Amino acid sequence: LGSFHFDPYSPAIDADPFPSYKRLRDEFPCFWSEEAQMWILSRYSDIVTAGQDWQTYSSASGNLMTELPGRAGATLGSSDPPKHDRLRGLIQHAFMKRNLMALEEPIRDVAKQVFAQVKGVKEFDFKDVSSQFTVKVLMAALGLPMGEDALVPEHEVRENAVLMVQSDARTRAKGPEHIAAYNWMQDYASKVIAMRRASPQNDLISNFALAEIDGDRLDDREVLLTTTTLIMAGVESLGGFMMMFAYNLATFDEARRAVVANPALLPDAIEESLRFNTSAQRFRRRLMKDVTLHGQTMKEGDFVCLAYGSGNRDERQYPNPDVYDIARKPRGHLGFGGGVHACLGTAIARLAVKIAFEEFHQVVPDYRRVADQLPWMPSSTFRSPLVLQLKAQ
Template identity: 60%
Template sequence: MFRFDPYSPAIDADPFPAYKVLRDEHPCFWSEEAGMWVLSRHEDILHALTNWRTYSSAKGNLVDEFPGRAGATLGSTDPPRHDRLRALIQQAMTKRALDHVIAPAHASCAAHLAALEGRDSFDFVNDFGSKVTVDLLFYLFALPPDNADQVRDNAVLMVQTDPVTRQKTEAHLAAFRWMADFAASLVEERKRNPGDDLLSSFITAEIEGEKLLDKEVQLTVTTLIMAGIESLSGFLGMFALNLADHPEARRALVADPSLIPDAIEESLRFNTSAQRFKRTLTQDVELHGQVMKAGDAVMLCYGAANRDERKFPDPDRYDIARKPKMHLGFGGGVHACLGSMLARLATQHVFAAFLQAVPEFSRVDRDLAWVPSSNFRSPQVLRLTRGR
């Protein structure tokens, strides 16, 4: 009997065979382990993402949600409240031109690449990708640099779930509380001493006399730090993994860095770090012969939709010339990732620098340790060795 357990280490290691069975044989599947329905086809998930009145985010969008987060962040609200939050956050983000991150990205890459000089092998995730990601977030939010290690460690813990208990443990909840307290202290400090940074822009953003509430700023910052560190760092690791496993693609990017943006889109389709998110039904839905009831939770498997042959021909082939349209690497609908442009830009410049410094590499370990998470998928460690 087929089972789908999103907490399984086997799913972390390689979810794609199970995704194919879901798409082909069980496109609307009840997972006992997750306690929710699972959708896996691109058409069904795109419909859910664009039909927020039925597939609601108001009870949280994480498969395992944190207490107090649902209904108070951009990803865990529905319109019209979602639209208000998004407009205010978007206004704050546009105050800082995306080009402002290019110089800090180059500086960060240069510093961490210099630290790798003379080393035949290194861990891309912990020696480079994660460090660059934290540097960029600390720059955007003007965070105190002495907190960098604590912020990263707690952000990584926040996205994890325990594969044995199948839930957030006290350690994961404590990491969330630490990050929320950290964000609250930053909000209070920045209200007293505003600056030219993203956090200050969140506080001062205003539309028709309305501003973000302090709790909304706090939870937005908490979520953006968590998602920024895990999503961007995770995707950088996945991109490096794709290029290690597909040397012909890597050599094409080394020869012509203008191809990197297209390679980013294919990597987002082929191996997105954002694998699974949740919605809650506001009414009964009949789909593929199953009746999902109002109040039921539904898991949207972006990673499965991105390998759906009904949408993408030959989906298990990594092809940087594919130019995939409407992949779900950043979700979709009203809840499409607000930081997608920033993530694309940062990834483009980070890999342009990395590939110039390390044009040839391969991975050391065939079997990888993966972040245990019901939402995200990325390697905890990615050891690379220079040369062919």
């Protein structure tokens, strides 16, 4: 009794990691967690340094806190340069050719359709609308055919996208149904990719197949794995963050009233929510050499947790860090990571959340949490409520 532990597999850390993060930063800034069997970095400046130093802190053994089964050499998140940079350059080229900000209309169309479903409703769970919106945004961006009339109906894609990002609550690892959903999605994406190769369209999948930089192109394994890992990354992170932003606005009346009255404040409020509580809380790296930090002798081959959610609450970087201040305009926050793996979806996410809440707030201009104590999702990497029950006010 009394000994300090940090267990990212613990439901206590799902629900409220922040007091433990503060003890890490203040008392144990390079902490060995016996439950995670890895070191924990918690201070903003240490996380920035480690995230930038990919030669020391490798992603090639996986970047999720709990492990990913497949082909890391074709993924961005679980690869190191130079391969990572070749892939990222080609994908960013495809993003440029499509023009991500021209997704304004399909995203706003989705938002109007989804959030109309809570018009006039006394009480609802934001998880439903936010998951629907999230998957529809990824489908519209990639070019996965939408509508229940589509050959593969939309709700079936959503069901498999939502399941494939989940993990077993007990072990926080993937189970057979999660791997089956991933393989279903790989097969589904493969059929769309073939169709877009035959007849390119104004979507991201088509631009993945067409992108070339001085004779280089993404190979067959690479267009597929790019499509599927963008679905995976987007659904897990954007869906969780949609919930975090609504949770904050429901909790902090003055912030909610301000952005509803002046929706031009939404981008700043979104950045303060990314700082205050990103959905993408904790990622891992593997040491490529021995590193001594704060008196601790980390060893080659050890794993390390970059607790982005802790660095963003570090008073050494952000004064009064536990204050939710939508006027803060935080710069350099870690809500999207940092370095060569900084979120590839940053611009899409910022646009999508902005448009979603523009339209949501026209349907429901005032709302609060129903609950004091909320249930939180079991994840060693991500954080969001399982249920975000809101009441119209």
